[PDB]
């Protein structure tokens, strides 16, 4: 019963495991979390591409082989954060947990996946520049030190006009102001900014109405959103969790029935059945956590935030 090679990459690390015919998604995850030393697991998941090109999350409950993981030598997984909190500030408790979000969000912005205006960009870059190098000191940090650093989204490089140096000089100015800022805060401060971005935390899907117009259905922490195909930023129709009563689907048809019966029902169409199941999958997840975060803190969570207060407090 030969084992199946697997590669799981964290944000800043590569892990190589060996699975079997019937190793559940759970097992794999549980191990990755153990090997990485991550506790707040409810935020992550293993991501991958299916036989037919789409990205998606590994179902923990059904088996790893028993889902469309692209058939390639080491099965490729990305231990990447699945759900985003409503306020990065008081939901991400541990340094490590705080971390992987920072790095995950950074990449996304640098890859234009999460849009970002040039100013917000330069500021964000400055915070990372603070978190990587520490305090600006001129004696060591002379001009062009940010020469070899990836810092800004591409869209703000190609669509503008500064040289790389000028741009660098801006990050440079901001960098000077963030003095005496530990990397923990530098990182959190980054996220605080980023979470207010229009695209942050949104899962986009390709769909159509009944006519046949292209549309984007987004699933985020607060509910659903229907976007116009050319505007992935502004929702043309939002469906907060509390205004929806029940979400359902048949092969390619999806329906969003509003809690208000005087209101009509919404329906969009999905390319393949797999996408509708995946959309509903994410809706459970976020909603699930949307409630867990409006009820008292689990004891485990309590001692976490507690033990966390002592890890940044002081001494004598």
């Amino acid at each position: 019963p030969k084992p199946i090679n697997v590669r799981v990459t964290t944000m800043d690390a590569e892990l190589e495991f060996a699975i079997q015919p019937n190793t559940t998604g759970k097992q794999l995850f549980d191990q990755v979390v153990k090997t990485v030393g991550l506790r707040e697991v409810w935020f992550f998941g293993l991501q991958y591409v299916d036989s037919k090109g789409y990205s998606t999350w590994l179902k923990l409950n059904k088996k790893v082989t028993q889902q469309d993981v692209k058939k390639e030598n080491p099965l490729q997984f990305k231990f990447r954060a699945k759900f985003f909190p409503e306020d990065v500030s008081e939901e991400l408790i541990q340094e490590i947990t705080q971390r992987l979000f920072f790095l995950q969000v950074k990449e996304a912005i640098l890859n234009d996946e999460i849009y970002c205006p040039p100013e917000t960009a330069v500021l964000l870059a400055s915070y990372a520049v603070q978190a990587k190098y520490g305090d600006y000191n001129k004696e060591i940090h002379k001009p062009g030190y940010l020469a070899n650093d990836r810092l800004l989204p591409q869209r703000v490089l190609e669509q503008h006009k500064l040289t790389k140096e000028q741009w660098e000089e801006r990050i440079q100015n901001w960098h000077e102001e963030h003095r005496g800022m530990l990397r923990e805060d530098s990182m959190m401060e980054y996220l605080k900014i980023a979470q207010d971005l229009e695209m942050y935390g949104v899962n986009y899907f390709e769909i159509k109405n009944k006519k046949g117009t292209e549309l984007w259905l987004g699933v985020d922490a607060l509910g659903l959103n229907i976007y116009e195909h050319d505007d992935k930023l502004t929702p043309k129709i939002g469906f907060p969790w509390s205004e929806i009563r029940n979400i359902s689907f048949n092969d390619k048809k999806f329906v969003i029935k509003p809690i208000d019966k005087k209101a009509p029902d919404f329906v969009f169409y999905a390319p393949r059945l797999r996408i509708n199941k995946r959309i509903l999958a994410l809706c459970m997840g976020n909603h699930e956590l949307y409630m867990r975060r409006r009820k008292p803190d689990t004891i485990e969570v309590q001692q976490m935030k507690a033990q966390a207060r002592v890890d940044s407090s002081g001494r004598i």
Partner: peptide, 15 residues
Amino acid sequence: KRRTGALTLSGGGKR
């Protein structure tokens, strides 16, 4: 095989 599916949210059930 597996074709259909739904999740009841606001339904006075989950609070």
